Amino acid sequence: HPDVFNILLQVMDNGTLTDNNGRKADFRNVVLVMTTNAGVRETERKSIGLIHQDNSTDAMEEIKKIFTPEFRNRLDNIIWFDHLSTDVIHQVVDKFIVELQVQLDQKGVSLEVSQEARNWLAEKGYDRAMGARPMARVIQDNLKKPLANELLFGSLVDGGQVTVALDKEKNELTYGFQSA
Amino acid sequence: AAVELAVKYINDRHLPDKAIDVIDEAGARARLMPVSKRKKTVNVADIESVVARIARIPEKSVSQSDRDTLKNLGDRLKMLVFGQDKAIEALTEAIKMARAGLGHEHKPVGSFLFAGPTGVGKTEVTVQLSKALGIELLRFDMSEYMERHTVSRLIGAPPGYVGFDQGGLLTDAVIKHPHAVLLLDEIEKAHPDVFNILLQVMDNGTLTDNNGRKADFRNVVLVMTTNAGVRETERKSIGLIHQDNSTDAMEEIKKIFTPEFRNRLDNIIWFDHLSTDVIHQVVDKFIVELQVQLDQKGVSLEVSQEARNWLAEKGYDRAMGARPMARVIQDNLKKPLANELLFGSLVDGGQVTVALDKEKNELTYGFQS
Amino acid sequence: HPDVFNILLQVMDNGTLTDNNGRKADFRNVVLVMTTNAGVRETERKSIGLIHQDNSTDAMEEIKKIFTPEFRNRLDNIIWFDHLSTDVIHQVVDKFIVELQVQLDQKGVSLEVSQEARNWLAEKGYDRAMGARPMARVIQDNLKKPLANELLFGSLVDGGQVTVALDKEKNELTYGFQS
Amino acid sequence: LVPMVIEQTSRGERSFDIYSRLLKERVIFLTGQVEDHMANLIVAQMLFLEAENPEKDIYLYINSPGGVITAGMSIYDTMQFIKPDVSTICMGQAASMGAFLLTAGAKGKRFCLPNSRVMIHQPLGGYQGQATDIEIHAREILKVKGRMNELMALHTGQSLEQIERDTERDRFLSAPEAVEYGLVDSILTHR
Amino acid sequence: LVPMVIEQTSRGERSFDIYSRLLKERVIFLTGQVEDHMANLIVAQMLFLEAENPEKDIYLYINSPGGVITAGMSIYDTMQFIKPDVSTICMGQAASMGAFLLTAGAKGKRFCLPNSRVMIHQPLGGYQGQATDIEIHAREILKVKGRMNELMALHTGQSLEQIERDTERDRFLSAPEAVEYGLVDSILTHR
Amino acid sequence: LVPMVIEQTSRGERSFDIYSRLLKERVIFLTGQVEDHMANLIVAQMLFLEAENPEKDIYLYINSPGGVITAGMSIYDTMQFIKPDVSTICMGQAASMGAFLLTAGAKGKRFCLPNSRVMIHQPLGGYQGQATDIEIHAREILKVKGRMNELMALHTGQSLEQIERDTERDRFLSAPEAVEYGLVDSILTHR
Ligand SMILES: Nc1ncnc2c1ncn2[C@@H]1O[C@H](COP(=O)(O)OP(=O)(O)O)[C@@H](O)[C@H]1O
């Protein structure tokens, strides 16, 4: 509700918010970070024109409409996050893979993914509009699914090393369960 | 394990107390459970079982006891629901990953938007999944939550409800049953403000009530059913050349659901119209239910393969899926049996047989008690 | 309103309705019947053209667009009430007149309405647009009202033995007064 | 000025012009000299009705004194292409192009009022310029004349030789005479 | 006049124009002499359709006797620029500019009705002025003629010399002849 | 007729004409002979867009044969006055005062389609009356000519002498040639 914005005017301009009882809280050491998806539809949609338009500015105008000027002036700065480029996506895939390894370590299985396989995952799941969340889903559908069946139904009940490779001819991933 | 597991699965309790609770219960359970053949030591498996009971969630020992149940989960759901295998695989694989330890740390077991035509099994696979797993089914009909003010009931109570029982229906339901299937039928009908409530459920795995109780959704399967794109697909073009209206369904889905909500979804399954081959399986299923109903009254029914095919042709409608099969089953079989069941040979003895003649093109019912 | 149909979907599909209050209403024994006049308008009206187009399937088309497929799928069957033919119309007047005769029987009055009078009563009583709803007044006004007025205060105070016959010139019903 | 008409609906009253109201009943109107813009409208109306109910039959009321043949071909081709049978009813008069569309109606659904007239004749297009250009344009109209006669003969059922002799000059046919010639199956009467 | 039409949407009943209703289905109509205003309108329609669904292909019904070349070239560029394949159908007749847009359709999606006609001729333009101005003005006519022939040859696939010989004078090509020439892929029959 | 397009929004359905819908997307169409009334309409559109989003970029599809020089300066003044970068695209022909507005777009955002043609020439105007008035009017027509050459030189980057020499006689520049001249940054040539 817009009332919440009015509640934060003293939080950012004076640092103190008072309860109905009358006690005052101190916000001088609390890092305040807000997140908003305003103008997400504007970015997702495409302009009706020969030349595509960057709708990053449309989000800012929406921010002005939603938030009152007093609220926005108090803010230190309005950071506009940018879409994930293909280069950082490779780093993003590495992050999910290590998260998978931590889950796998408890089970006793070690996962090894070739560099070519990692690139293949990025191309299949890359979606600038959808960000990094599709990358998790492609990894989940491709890597976590085979491992899950094997861990439960065989070849991985007991901890064993795993290796992943890409077949260029078939353009499909391969796996070596190698139990124990 | 007691400390690490308590943090993960035991909420609203602080760490030095949670672990002591797990540790104390493990000692109590092992000491008095086996009268003879008692293990003096407390292994890690005992701790996992204790947390499971406290949190009402399965443990991590699925690789031995329940390995058979998960392996046959997809096969059993195929017998109950024909076609739509992509939905069954999505649900069973999502479950397997969670039990195997690959599930998301802070997200539900699964979040799937099942969109398709009527009578295609959108709300049937969810009801059968819970029965297969033997877990409580949380069914919420969004037709009630059309307005903004009704949404507050999910996370609380109406403004100034001094009366007790002011706990959110969704928050209290999930707390009572941490392991359950959450079905939000006709999610499109719900006010857009309901999608904002699910953002923390799908992405953070928890929803907080106005009072402040935290509901855990990390172990609940979230399934939503919508008929958003059926109208667009069924729409017929007006032009010399017919148009391939294949992607129109997704475009309608994109408009009704904001990108943030759709991104959180684990997978969007598009159910498809039942094929003629699938209808034969459906006829057999309905007949099986009829046999069970007759078994209560002591009547036995056997139908010929030829009669089954005739029933399929009469009831095969692409737009209406499998629901019309019930109507022909009702008109053709239940009507004669009902009259005889009340008064006639079917009072007792059963031994019913059904057949048809190709020339007549009409079913024949014979009763010999 | 469309929102009402959404409420019935769970009723027919699940058989149980939950009120906002919180109580669970389980009504699986109640039969559900709805009455609509959507198709009659299309079928009764003729096509706007020199050629009369076929309206046999027009009635179903309206119901398909007016009612969502999901709503129609849950319904057991859709039954059409057809216009009352002359043969069945005779039975309707027979029921109304016989009903009045039963009421008069306790009082002791008797009627001898002719079969020809039945035909004339049917045309005025039954209308294609309003059906048999106007037929209520025709039987009561044409038969009960003239005789009832005479019964309370008339040439014949009591004894009945009344008879009725169609009058071609006046299009009125004869009243017999035998004490 | 087009008068509006109210059509009762379950939701409420709906206001539509007289032409649009009849279009809902599949009653299209062809009027005036044929042109690229009226034909585009007529074909557009046919395509709209096809998707609604392809089984149902469209009805085209032809009251035109003739027009450009090229524009009419779009109407003719559209009628044949669509699954729905097009019923052509000649109101008042059907000239060379109007008669072509009239006879092009589906068999059994073509009708003429008892007092209408039907005139058929060869195209009267002309061109001027260099001798070489005139030859190409002159040659083309003979090709078009062949197509008009061959498609007219197919629908009417008369031989190509019969059509060309009659179409040498303007020939006005009455409604009964049209039935004998084969342009229409019957004369529209109130059953 | 334009007959309004009813469309049943998920939201409820909606009233659209005859052309507007067809625009929702990606059907764009090109009719009459090409001009800047109508060309600009077609351009606007194509851009709107691309935004709604770029995957879905656009349909264009061309029934035109030819017009300004500059206006038409804007349409051609837009058709090639946008990702959707702009299917082209020849209703009734297509002139040199009309046929240039017809052949510009994507491969496998260009059609011509059976009784449709086509015409292709060199661009005809006349300028009056000083000899110096005529030289500069004349050069543009040669350049555009070559560009049109080159583009026409590219879509049809025929030799440039053959296109130059045929384009020197007006040439009329029937529907079956257009398919062989390469202007259209195939005739539309019972789709 | 102008088609009506439905814009789907979360709040509800909205109906807009094809041109107005494009204006909502910061697309302006400068089509037809330049005039005071049409130029005023374009000026109003730019100001409305500037207020809605000054930081965002405006677009101006120029398909016009040129026109009134003074009316066009109102657009040029407004293009440079408003903070938004008024990108320009050229569809079909661009002529005197059409190209002047096409070359006045922000650097790096001007574009021309592959087949678009650009024409540039000096102002053409005449006055009839007393010799004294002709001298005054003649001086006015010369001063305006120099100002356009100065402005054209600024955007293109060529010296004033180069522009004056070329602009003395009508000069037609192809789309790639315009890039060499500097009227536009580059050709789109994108899918
Ligand atoms: N594939 C199927 N196999 C068996 N029963 C089915 C199937 N599809 C639908 N049904 C039956 O139809 C009903 C489910 O319809 P549902 O898919 O929930 O409809 P909707 O999509 O309109 O919500 C139940 O009665 C169920 O038994």
Author numbering:
A (entry chain C): 570 to 749
B (entry chain D): 380 to 748
C (entry chain E): 570 to 748
D (entry chain H), E (entry chain I), F (entry chain J): 2 to 192
Task: Reproduce passages from the article.
For example, density for the ClpS NTE was present in both the ClpA D1 and D2 rings in classes I and II, but only in the D1 ring of class III. Loss of D2 pore-1 loop engagement with the ClpS NTE is a major feature distinguishing our class-III structures from classes I and II. Most surprisingly, the D2 pore-1 loops in class III were rotated ~90° compared to their orientation in classes I and II, and the key Tyr540 side chains were tucked in and turned away from the channel. In both class-III subclasses, at least four of the six pore-1 loops were convincingly in the tucked conformation. Three additional features of the class-III D2 ring are noteworthy. Coincident with the pore-1-loop rotation, the ClpA channel in the D2 ring of class III was ~2 Å wider than in classes I and II. Second the D2 rigid-body interface between the small AAA+ domain of subunit E and its neighboring large AAA+ domain in subunit F was broken in class III. Finally, the D2 ring contained ADP in three adjacent subunits in class III, whereas classes I and II contained no more than two ADPs in the D2 ring. Moreover, the portion of the ClpS NTE in the D1 ring of class-III structures is bound in the same fashion as our class-I and class-II structures.
